[PDB]
Design a protein around this ligand. Sequence first.
Ligand code: SF4
Ligand code: SF4
Ligand code: FES
Ligand SMILES: [Mg+2]
Ligand SMILES: [Zn+2]
Lengths: 208, 689, 48, 114, 85, 124, 96
Amino acid sequence: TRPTIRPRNDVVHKQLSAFGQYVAEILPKYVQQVQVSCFNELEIFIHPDGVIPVLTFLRDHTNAQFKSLADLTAVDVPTRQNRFEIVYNLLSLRFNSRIRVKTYTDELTPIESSVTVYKAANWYEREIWDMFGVFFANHPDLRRILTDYGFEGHPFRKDFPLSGYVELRYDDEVKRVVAEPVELAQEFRKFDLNSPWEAFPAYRQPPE
Amino acid sequence: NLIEVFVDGQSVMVEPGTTVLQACEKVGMQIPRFCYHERLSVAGNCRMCLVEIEKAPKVVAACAMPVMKGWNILTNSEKSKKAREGVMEFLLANHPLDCPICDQGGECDLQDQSMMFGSDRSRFLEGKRAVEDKNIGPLVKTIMTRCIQCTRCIRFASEIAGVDDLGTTGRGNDMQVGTYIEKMFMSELSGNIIDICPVGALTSKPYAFTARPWETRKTESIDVMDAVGSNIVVSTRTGEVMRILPRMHEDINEEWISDKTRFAYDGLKRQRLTQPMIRNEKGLLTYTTWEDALSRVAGMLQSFQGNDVAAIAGGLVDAEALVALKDLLNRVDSDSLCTEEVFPTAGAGTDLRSNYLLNTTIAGVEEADVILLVGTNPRFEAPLFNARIRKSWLHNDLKVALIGSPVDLTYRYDHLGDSPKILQDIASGNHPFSQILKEAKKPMVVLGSSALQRSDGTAILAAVSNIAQNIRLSSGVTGDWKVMNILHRIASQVAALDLGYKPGVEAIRKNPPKVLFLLGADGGCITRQDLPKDCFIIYQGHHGDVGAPMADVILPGAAYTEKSATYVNTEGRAQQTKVAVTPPGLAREDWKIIRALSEIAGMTLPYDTLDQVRSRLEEVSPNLVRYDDVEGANYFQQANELSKLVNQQLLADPLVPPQLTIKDFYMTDSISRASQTMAKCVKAVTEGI
Amino acid sequence: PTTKPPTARKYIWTNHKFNVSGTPQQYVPYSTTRKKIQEWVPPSTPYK
Amino acid sequence: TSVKPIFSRDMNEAKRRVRELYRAWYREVPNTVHLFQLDISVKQGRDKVREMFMKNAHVTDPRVVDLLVIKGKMELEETINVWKQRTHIMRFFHETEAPRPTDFLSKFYVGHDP
Amino acid sequence: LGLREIRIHLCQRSPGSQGVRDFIEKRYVELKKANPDLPILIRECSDVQPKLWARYAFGQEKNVSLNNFSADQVTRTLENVLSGK
Amino acid sequence: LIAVDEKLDITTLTGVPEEHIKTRKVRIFVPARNNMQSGVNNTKKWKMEFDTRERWENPLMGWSSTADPLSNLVLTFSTKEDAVAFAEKNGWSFDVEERKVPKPKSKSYGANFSWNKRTRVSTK
Amino acid sequence: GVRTSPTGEKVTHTGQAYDDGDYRRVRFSDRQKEVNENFAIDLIAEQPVSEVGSRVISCDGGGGALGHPRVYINLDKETKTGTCGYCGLQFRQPHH
Ligand code: SF4
Ligand code: SF4
Ligand code: FES
Ligand SMILES: [Mg+2]
Ligand SMILES: [Zn+2]
């Protein structure tokens, strides 16, 4: 029975693989790669300029009715040339399925806004811009959403310090809240927790 | 040629004699281990490295089994996993539940390998074994209930340290590791048994209970206690130095550090200089401000000039500080710059680096065939150099000959008298060792710099250079092998000689100065007895040992753990110490202090940042900014020709090294003298028990 | 507690104290660790 | 290597956009001073706008200039719509920050800063 | 006017330092013997041109490029510094 | 698609203060293996960390205070070239340390029982 | 076993006591200093020594799962008492 191990769904794995081949054949111009995770989650890696065609197909196609945009976020990987990774999660209610579309960009490369396909993309792209600095070209209203007014820098980048650079306090001389360089009574204590022994041999990388 | 083996179906070419563990290391797989250490011999008793061969029905010890042609190694097979689980089950079945009160804590190999390869449950329903704890000195704390009988300390003791006082007594489950008598394992390489013990059986006593591995921040710096230039890691916690650990460098350090390096970090917390000090109307030292102290020093510097200005550099000074002080003293046309260590200036002197450097690198000792030590005690002057010599001796039948005092090295050597008359005899060719050197393919002559401190250091240098020249003439002239070698015992000596400081204080003795800058000079070579009356002394340093008591103005500076600095070891390699903590109190960086003093005096130095100071260092000597490089030109012919022209007479005194015992090793410099752990070690080795 | 009295220990407070904030008996924080660095003490005797 | 442009193609159109943004900011300072009841002068506000523009005068990449003018337009529309308060407008001036010493001797006296 | 020290920086492998290396090999010993009290420090460069720094009194230093110089040219340049012309 | 003959420089866009842009030197290096353990899984990725700044003792409770925002910031890169490119485009100074890998070693169990060599062990 | 410093300030079990010239004693003016009167070292010294006729004894701190992890103390060194270090409890084989 193996009660401590999650059961696997080969039927769903095969269905997702077949649909991945289907979409890859239908859109060869932009689809760069297709993967299926072992917990049955389809993933498509496309060219950054194929966002609008791929999303429009996945929304309007009869066999792919992904009418709902579940989420839209970014992942920062500084070791890559195109550090920012834009991730779209789509939900198909007609077929009761979920799909993921992943593209890449850097600081100075705009990404076409998908507000014309999904309306939630408006606030999702505003948050992505506010937190990472990724610019979306045709956005009806692109501005900060979460950070303070006049905040400098994008907090969610990996190179942004955890406590930031400035702090706020009330200064009685000027009778207003003032911003001053950060200074902590107790410094955040960094812990080195990585064990020096490899845990999962299945993910071992070549020594190169 | 290389043979082809397979690891998990992946082909890899390995040299004959390669073991399964090394083949897996080449393919990128690290087999678990407890008794196997790459620097020690192969034991094959912990049985944790058992792996399955595809067609062999029996598991093999990967650390000791050579690979055969066409062998498929199944590292992650079911049999291998079951073997690992069983071995871990036995080890943990007999192990005690001491993890929370154990200094090994979060950096234990038993814990990590249990979490990665062992089971998560215990079937042991019996009573555990308790073992009496031994006592092997004030440095290593033994809680031997945690020993897993892996025999790493025994093999290390014997092979590396040349001390055979560790072993296993009894047999069966009651086998115990110890001395069997109340004997202290006191040696210059004793903390490495603390490092290599995979469990908390051997732990550091000064570091006991203070911190945990996950809290500490690691700063990669180098060692300044001796001239080897060992690479270390400083473990700090909330801006306080907590521990010193070795850092691998196969050409210098090779995973080992000396006990003085490891356990003298607690001298940085005592007798520290934290505020500038002047003298009041009563002549007593009182705290003052940087502006006032620097104004007084600048006034004296403006009042005096010429050869009436001297500087004495100590043993823990950096290249940036040395070059800043040199420029400051050259601003006033003054030139009484000196180091508190003597090197023969006759002939080539400090002009050629291949005259005071260790030309044959430390890694080059392993390639030598015959080595001759003159007037040195490498077991205490440079413990890692002696360790490398011992390793070469053991693994290549290296013939070691020592001229002078019969110090107890950790290996058998041919003793040659105690007088430099033998040194002259070898050069002439009467001694049989001349024939041994002639027939040797790779000879080496290492002259200790402590022997150059005598009144006839120039004569000794000329004699050893003549020996090297005779070797060159008789043997092959062709080849890049370098015979002449000089071994230093002061960290800053090589950097000062490269920058252009005059070695020794003979110049200052000849011309008494009116202004004296003691830059970390705690050796006591020159005092107010030698100085003229009412001489003005500015002592810039971080510990108050001699210069601070006898100084007029005291300027607190930064320690090596507290400043970013450059140090050149005995073989000419330059390494930069990084910042671990910040100087206490009002202490500042040394070159910054010198630059501020120059600015106040009006002769402002042209550098304001570390990059600019290092550009100045590059201008004076580019080898001080080429860090990892050790290659250099050879000018032995020129040095020998310049040495031959003027010669003197050798004294009729025995060559006695300044350090003859481990207590003399323990007390060498200001940090060691301020250390409490070193005091405990001295008391233990003197009074015993 | 009349039916089931608590276990008696020698270190338990005999007199209970209420919240003493705003009173002279209030808790005041301080560091319980010694000084990390000892500074050098210059000699009390003159020189030269 | 050819890269996708945000705007302006070459540098001339980027400079044109910079000048447009500068005009928009210049014509907004009196309104900002009047609405926010700032105690500063209009000349001080114009000089601060000039200073903020000048600290990016070393940029020679058209895409970076385009992003700079985009962020400038954002922070201008925050000021026009009174989304910012007097707090942020005065944060532009650092009126409470103590003057940091800049000479080597003063930096040496105060602490261990480079 | 009063020369204090001389520093000769030559790369041990670059072609441009071939003349300077030959000067050290066959001419340095005689030069040093004539000036026993003059500090003539020979050092090593990595990829820059060879240099001849001359530290005079009161911390004034003049640098002369020795790139692609022959042994004779190095000798003439060095003897100009010692003489003062 | 425009062509730019310029070096990448996003210092004006990162929002970092000029002090922490100019006066900072990062250290690119492969972490040294901890000598207390034989594992080598923490010596495979390059790291970028900033220089240590001043830490003082809080007057109250004696805690460890700081004024350096980039004290705890450590970045992981898969390649020295990637780390150098990131540091260059962010504008900080950098010092690079070459990776140190242990040299191959010839291990032989039979050498412990040599007939005439010094490698013979006196104990097991 | 509380002890008083020469400045009139009580000394804690860790030896903490502000110096005479330390300005930080002002925080205790018109207020008090939080010092715990019970000294663990003194109490554990006041505890007696248990004698058991076995080479190896086991200590779990009392209470079973409410104590500390079980450890084994080897009572072979006749010149000292074997101390369980979780609870600082001394055991000793019956001599004489
Ligand atoms: S040696 Fe390791 S397993 Fe044993 S008590 Fe210590 S931390 Fe635990
Ligand atoms: S004390 Fe440590 S190194 Fe020695 S045999 Fe026991 S576990 Fe191994
Ligand atoms: S590592 Fe091979 S048996 Fe111990
Ligand atoms: Mg250990
Ligand atoms: Zn107990």
